[PDB]
Amino acid sequence: DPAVTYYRLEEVAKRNTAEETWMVIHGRVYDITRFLSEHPGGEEILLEQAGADATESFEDIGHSPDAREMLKQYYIGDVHPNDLKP
Ligand code: HEM
Helix, strand or coil: CCCCCEECHHHHCCCEECCEEEEEECCEEEECHHHHHHCCCCCHHHHCCCCCECHHHHHHHCCCHHHHHHHHHHEEEEECHHHCCC
């Protein structure tokens, strides 16, 4: 409500290369550009889903509670409600 920044999925889709990498997880946008080289699962698997909603893959992997906490550092905004799916 207050100072929440909103992005359309169309904007997120443009950040799909190693130069500026964004990813959507549970309706929120994360800029993981600087996390690529630090990801224990490697950088390739992240680049393969860059610029898109990676929620299913993130959950399917079974990430730990510590992995979820790491997300906060990369949070940059929410996906506009009109772009969220049923
Ligand atoms: C951008 C948010 C993400 C964060 C912060 C993150 C963080 C992490 C962390 C901390 C681990 C180590 C877990 C452990 O100690 O067991 C890990 C492992 C892994 N991550 Fe991610 N991850 C993210 C997204 C993804 C995505 C989108 C995929 C793609 C399917 C992925 C695939 C993996 C895989 C395959 C492993 C290895 C697990 C194993 O050892 O079997 N991650 N991730």
